[PDB]
Amino acid sequence: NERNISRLWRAFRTVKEMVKDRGYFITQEEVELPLEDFKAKYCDSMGRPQRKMMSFQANPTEESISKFPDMGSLWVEFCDEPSVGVKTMKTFVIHIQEKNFQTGIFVYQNNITPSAMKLVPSIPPATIETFNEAALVVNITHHELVPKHIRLSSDEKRELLKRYRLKESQLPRIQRADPVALYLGLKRGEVVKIIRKSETSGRYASYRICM
């Protein structure tokens, strides 16, 4: 019961990296928060993790808001209830809506009730995404053979389609449920620039449109 603190601290780091990679403001120094510091701030006087102290909000960076004018705020919740029931989910949904968050990242420990799951798409235009803690211990996008995926702005996409005489329907595709698409929270119509980690320039990358 000490290696579970370490696993949580690592899941925490991955969530921060995911949010940073999506274009929200999180410092790398924060992403790299030392284990001791984590214990000192997010664990109680007896040394036990209090996930309710970990939840946080994130806003777009200045560079992101200029490219994505309609990009809103994001809320990350680490559920303190192992198996998430309908009532626990509803209170999370209520928070997202009332505080006007555009995206809600819902991290859970073991599972989420079927009834609870029925609430994920209940508050448009906001979207809620769910992630299992065990899957966040290691950042799947940090693998050497997984290239860098970067979402293009509407302007960039238009410029791409114009430069190559193509309709968006003629671009290589990426499935909505693709593991990297899920990581970035991609939506139908968005395009990602793909840069192999073996190449040393963002030039000639590949492009895929989300389904």
Curated annotation (Swiss-Prot):
PROSITE patterns: RNA_POL_H_23KD (PS01110). GO terms for cellular component: nucleoplasm; nucleus; RNA polymerase I complex; RNA polymerase II, core complex; RNA polymerase III complex. Pfam families: RNA_pol_Rpb5_C, RNA_pol_Rpb5_N. InterPro entries: Arch_Rpo5/euc_Rpb5, RNA_pol_Rpb5_N, RNA_pol_Rpb5_N_sf, RNA_pol_subH/Rpb5_C, RNA_pol_subH/Rpb5_CS, RPB5-like_sf. Signal peptide: none annotated. It is found in: Nucleus. It comes from the Eukaryota. One of its GO terms (molecular function) is DNA-directed RNA polymerase activity. Component of the RNA polymerase I (Pol I), RNA polymerase II (Pol II) and RNA polymerase III (Pol III) complexes. Component of the RNA polymerase I (Pol I) complex consisting of 14 subunits: RPA135, RPA190, RPC40, RPA14, RPB5, RPO26, RPA43, RPB8, RPA12, RPB10, RPC19, RPC10, RPA49 and RPA34. The complex is composed of a horseshoe-shaped core containing ten subunits (RPA135, RPA190, RPB5, RPO26, RPB8, RPB10, RPC10, RPA12, RPC19 and RPC40) where RPA135 and RPA190 form the DNA-binding cleft. DNA-dependent RNA polymerases catalyze the transcription of DNA into RNA using the four ribonucleoside triphosphates as substrates. Common component of RNA polymerases I, II and III which synthesize ribosomal RNA precursors, mRNA precursors and many functional non-coding RNAs, and small RNAs, such as 5S rRNA and tRNAs, respectively. Pol II is the central component of the basal RNA polymerase II transcription machinery. RNA polymerase complexes are composed of mobile elements that move relative to each other. Belongs to the archaeal Rpo5/eukaryotic RPB5 RNA polymerase subunit family. This is DNA-directed RNA polymerases I, II, and III subunit RPABC1. It comes from Saccharomyces cerevisiae (strain ATCC 204508 / S288c). The lineage of its organism: Eukaryota, Fungi, Dikarya, Ascomycota, Saccharomycotina.
